[PDB]
Short mmCIF file of C-alpha atoms and ligand atoms in Angstrom, two decimals:
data_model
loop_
_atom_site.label_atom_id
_atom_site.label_comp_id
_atom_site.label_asym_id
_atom_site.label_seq_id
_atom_site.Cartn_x
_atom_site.Cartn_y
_atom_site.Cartn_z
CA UNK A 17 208.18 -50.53 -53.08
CA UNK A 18 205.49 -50.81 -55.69
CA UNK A 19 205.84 -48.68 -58.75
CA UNK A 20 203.26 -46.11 -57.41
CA UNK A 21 204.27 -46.59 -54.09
CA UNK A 22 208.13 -45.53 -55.44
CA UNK A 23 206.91 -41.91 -56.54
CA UNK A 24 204.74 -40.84 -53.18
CA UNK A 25 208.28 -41.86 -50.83
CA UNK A 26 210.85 -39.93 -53.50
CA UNK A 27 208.73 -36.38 -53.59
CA UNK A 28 208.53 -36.52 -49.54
CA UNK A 29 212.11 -37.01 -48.86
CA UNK A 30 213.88 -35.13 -51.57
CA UNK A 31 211.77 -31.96 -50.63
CA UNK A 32 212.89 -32.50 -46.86
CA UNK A 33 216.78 -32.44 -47.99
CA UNK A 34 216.31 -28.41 -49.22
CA UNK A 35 212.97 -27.52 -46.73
CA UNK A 36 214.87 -28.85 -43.71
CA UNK A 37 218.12 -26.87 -44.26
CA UNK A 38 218.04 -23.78 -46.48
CA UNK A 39 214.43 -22.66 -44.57
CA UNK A 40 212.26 -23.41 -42.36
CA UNK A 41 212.01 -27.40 -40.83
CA UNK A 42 208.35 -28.16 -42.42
CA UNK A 43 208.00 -24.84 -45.00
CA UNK A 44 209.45 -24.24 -47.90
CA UNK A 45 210.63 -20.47 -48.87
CA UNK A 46 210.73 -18.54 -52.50
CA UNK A 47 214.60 -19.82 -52.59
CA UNK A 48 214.12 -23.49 -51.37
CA UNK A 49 211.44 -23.86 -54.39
CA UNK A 50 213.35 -22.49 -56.87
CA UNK A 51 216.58 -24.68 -56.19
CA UNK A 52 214.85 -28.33 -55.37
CA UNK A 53 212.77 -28.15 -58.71
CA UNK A 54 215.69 -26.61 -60.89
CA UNK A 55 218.37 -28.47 -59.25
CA UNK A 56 216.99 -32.66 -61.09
CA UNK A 57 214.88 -30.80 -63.28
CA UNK A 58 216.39 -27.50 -64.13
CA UNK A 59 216.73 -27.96 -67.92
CA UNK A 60 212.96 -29.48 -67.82
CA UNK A 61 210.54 -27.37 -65.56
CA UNK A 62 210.75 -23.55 -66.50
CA UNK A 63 212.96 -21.84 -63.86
CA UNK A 64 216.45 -20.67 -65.05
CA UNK A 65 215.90 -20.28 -68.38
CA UNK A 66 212.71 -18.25 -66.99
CA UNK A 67 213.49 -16.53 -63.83
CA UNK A 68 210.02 -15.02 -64.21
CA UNK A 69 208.66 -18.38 -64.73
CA UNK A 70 209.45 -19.63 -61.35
CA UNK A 71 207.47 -16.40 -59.88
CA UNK A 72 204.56 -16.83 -62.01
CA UNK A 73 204.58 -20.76 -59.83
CA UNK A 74 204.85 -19.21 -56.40
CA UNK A 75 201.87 -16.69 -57.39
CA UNK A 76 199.93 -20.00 -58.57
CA UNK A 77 200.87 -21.32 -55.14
CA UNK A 78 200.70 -18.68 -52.45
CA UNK A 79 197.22 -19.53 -52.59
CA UNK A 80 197.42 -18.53 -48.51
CA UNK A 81 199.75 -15.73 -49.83
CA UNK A 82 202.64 -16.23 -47.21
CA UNK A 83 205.46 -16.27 -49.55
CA UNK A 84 206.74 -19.79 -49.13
CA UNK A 85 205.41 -22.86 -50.63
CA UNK A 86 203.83 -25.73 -47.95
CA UNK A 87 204.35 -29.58 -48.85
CA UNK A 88 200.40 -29.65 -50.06
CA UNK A 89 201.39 -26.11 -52.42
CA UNK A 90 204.45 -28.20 -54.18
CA UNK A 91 203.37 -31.37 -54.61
CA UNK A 92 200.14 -29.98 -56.59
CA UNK A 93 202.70 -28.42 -58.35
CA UNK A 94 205.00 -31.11 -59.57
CA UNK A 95 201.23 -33.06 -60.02
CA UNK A 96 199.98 -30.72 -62.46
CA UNK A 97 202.57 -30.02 -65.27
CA UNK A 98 203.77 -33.68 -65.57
CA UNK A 99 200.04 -33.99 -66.28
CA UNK A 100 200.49 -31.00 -69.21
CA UNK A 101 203.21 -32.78 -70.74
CA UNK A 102 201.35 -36.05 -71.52
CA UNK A 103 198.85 -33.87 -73.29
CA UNK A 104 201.30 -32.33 -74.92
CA UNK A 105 203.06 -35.52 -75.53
CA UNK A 106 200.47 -36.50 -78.07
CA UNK A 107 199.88 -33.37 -79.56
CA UNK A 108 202.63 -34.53 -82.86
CA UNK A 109 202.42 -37.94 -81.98
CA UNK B 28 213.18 -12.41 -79.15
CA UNK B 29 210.87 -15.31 -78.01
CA UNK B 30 210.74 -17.49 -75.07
CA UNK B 31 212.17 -21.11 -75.94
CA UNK B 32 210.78 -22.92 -73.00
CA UNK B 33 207.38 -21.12 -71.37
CA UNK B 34 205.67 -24.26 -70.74
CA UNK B 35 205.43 -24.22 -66.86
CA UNK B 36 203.34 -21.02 -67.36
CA UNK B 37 201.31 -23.54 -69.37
CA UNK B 38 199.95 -23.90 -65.84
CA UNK B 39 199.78 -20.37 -64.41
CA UNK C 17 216.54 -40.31 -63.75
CA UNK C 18 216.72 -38.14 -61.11
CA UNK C 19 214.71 -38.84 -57.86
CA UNK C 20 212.16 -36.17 -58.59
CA UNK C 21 212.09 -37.32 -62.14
CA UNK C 22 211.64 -41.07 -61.45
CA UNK C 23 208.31 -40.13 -59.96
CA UNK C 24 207.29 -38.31 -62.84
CA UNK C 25 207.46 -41.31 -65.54
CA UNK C 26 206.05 -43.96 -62.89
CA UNK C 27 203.09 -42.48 -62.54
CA UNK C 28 202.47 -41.84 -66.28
CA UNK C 29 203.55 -45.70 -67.34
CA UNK C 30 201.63 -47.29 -64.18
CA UNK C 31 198.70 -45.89 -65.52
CA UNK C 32 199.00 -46.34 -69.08
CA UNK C 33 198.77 -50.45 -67.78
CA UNK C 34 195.41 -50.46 -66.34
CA UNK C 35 193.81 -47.47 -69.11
CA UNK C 36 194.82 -48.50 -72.18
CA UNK C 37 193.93 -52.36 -71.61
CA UNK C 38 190.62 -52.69 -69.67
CA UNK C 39 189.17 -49.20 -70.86
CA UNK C 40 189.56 -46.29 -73.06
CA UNK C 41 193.13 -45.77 -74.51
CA UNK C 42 193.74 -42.42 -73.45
CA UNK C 43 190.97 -42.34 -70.78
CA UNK C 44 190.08 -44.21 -67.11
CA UNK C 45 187.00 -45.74 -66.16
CA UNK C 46 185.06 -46.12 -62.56
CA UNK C 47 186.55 -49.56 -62.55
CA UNK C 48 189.85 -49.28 -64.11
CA UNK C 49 190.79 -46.17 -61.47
CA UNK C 50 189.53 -48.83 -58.28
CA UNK C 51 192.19 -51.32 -60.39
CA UNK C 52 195.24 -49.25 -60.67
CA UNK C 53 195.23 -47.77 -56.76
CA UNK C 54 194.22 -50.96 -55.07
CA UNK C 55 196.84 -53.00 -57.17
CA UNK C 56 199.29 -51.18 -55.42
CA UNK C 57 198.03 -49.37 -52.58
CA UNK C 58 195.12 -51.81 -51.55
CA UNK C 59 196.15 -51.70 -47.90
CA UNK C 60 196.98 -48.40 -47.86
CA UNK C 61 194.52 -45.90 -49.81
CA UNK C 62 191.20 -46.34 -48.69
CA UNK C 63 189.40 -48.42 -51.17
CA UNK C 64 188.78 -51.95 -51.13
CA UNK C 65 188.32 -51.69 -46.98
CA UNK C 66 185.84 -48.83 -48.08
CA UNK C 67 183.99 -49.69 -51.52
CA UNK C 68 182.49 -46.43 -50.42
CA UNK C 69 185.63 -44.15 -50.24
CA UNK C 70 186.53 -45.11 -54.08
CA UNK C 71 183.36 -43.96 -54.87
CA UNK C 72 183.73 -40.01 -53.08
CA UNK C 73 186.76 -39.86 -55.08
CA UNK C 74 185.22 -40.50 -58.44
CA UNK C 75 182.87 -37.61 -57.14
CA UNK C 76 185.74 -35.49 -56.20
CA UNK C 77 187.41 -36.35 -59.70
CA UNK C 78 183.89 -36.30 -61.94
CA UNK C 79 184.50 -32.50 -61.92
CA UNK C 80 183.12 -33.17 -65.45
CA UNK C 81 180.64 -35.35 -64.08
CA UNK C 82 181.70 -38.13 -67.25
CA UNK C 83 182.32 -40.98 -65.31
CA UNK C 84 185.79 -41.58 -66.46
CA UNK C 85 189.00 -40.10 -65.01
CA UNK C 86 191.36 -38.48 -66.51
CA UNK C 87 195.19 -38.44 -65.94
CA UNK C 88 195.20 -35.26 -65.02
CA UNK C 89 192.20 -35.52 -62.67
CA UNK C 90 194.10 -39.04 -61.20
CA UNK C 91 197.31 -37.69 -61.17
CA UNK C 92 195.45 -34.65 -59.31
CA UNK C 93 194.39 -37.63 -56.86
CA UNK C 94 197.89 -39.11 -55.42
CA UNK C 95 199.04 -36.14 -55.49
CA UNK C 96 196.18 -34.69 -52.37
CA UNK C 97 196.62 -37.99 -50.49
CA UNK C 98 200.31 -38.42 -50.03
CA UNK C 99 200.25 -34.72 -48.68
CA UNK C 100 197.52 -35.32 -46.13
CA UNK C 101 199.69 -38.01 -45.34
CA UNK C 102 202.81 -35.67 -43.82
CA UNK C 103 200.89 -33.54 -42.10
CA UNK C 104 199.08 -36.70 -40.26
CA UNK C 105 202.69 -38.11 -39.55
CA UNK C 106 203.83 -35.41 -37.70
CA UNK C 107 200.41 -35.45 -35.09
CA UNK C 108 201.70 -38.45 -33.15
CA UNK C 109 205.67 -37.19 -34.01
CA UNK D 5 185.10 -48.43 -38.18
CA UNK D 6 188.54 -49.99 -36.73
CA UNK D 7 188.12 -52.74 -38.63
CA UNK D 8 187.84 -50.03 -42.01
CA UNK D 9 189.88 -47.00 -43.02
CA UNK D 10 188.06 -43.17 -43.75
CA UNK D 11 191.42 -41.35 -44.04
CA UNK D 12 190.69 -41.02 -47.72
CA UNK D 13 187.29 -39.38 -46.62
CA UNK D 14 189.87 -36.94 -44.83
CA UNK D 15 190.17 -35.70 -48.86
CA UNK D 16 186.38 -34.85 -49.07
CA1 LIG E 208 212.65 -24.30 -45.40
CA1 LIG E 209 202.46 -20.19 -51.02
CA1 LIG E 210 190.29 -46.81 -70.24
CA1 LIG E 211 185.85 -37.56 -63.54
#
């Protein structure tokens, strides 16, 4: 796999592993989010160490307001703070 | 108290 | 790295190749963007088979209507397709 | 339009 080609195949099978057994077989639920973005990036993301920040997330995506978090709601997720932190990356330099 | 990490609501 | 975090750095290196050599340093151009996808995903995105389809999503992405792209309106990008992408897979099952 | 792909299009 080419580099870019790498990152599209890891976010589509790692999110099957928790949507395909803790919750429904293609939706994700409040509790599958919370563990397959805290569980590789728990001390990263803000989740644990914000148990309100995972909520303010789901609000962000339950853009159709059903509670649980569809493959197109996550991956803009993961998409748009990875983004933040390269801005943030050259704030000091 | 302050919140060490709040990033992520960065985005929301 | 973890699987979700490998993803996270390829993206952000991969991109840094094509941007900070043929263009801007910390910003894309209409040709470096067509450069960095089709390297990698010319058969698959549609853009070289479609000269046309690069250029509706430099519309999509010239939300600021500068002609550039930034990483956050690429990363934005990869991030829509690959989705659109599962939900297309499961059609023919 | 075989011979080409639109699926991208499928984004706009
Ligand atoms: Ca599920
Ligand atoms: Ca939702
Ligand atoms: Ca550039
Ligand atoms: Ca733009």
């Amino acid at each position: 796999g080419s580099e870019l080609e790498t990152a599209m195949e890891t976010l589509i099978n790692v999110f099957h592993a928790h949507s395909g057994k803790e919750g429904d077989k293609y939706k994700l639920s409040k509790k599958e989010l919370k563990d397959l973005l805290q569980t590789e990036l728990s001390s990263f993301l803000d989740v644990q160490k914000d148990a309100d920040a995972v909520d303010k997330i789901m609000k962000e995506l339950d853009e159709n307001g059903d509670g649980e978090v569809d493959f197109q709601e996550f991956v803009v997720l993961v998409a748009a703070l990875t983004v933040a932190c390269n801005n943030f990356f050259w704030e000091n330099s | 108290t302050r919140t060490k990490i709040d990033w992520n609501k960065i985005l929301s």
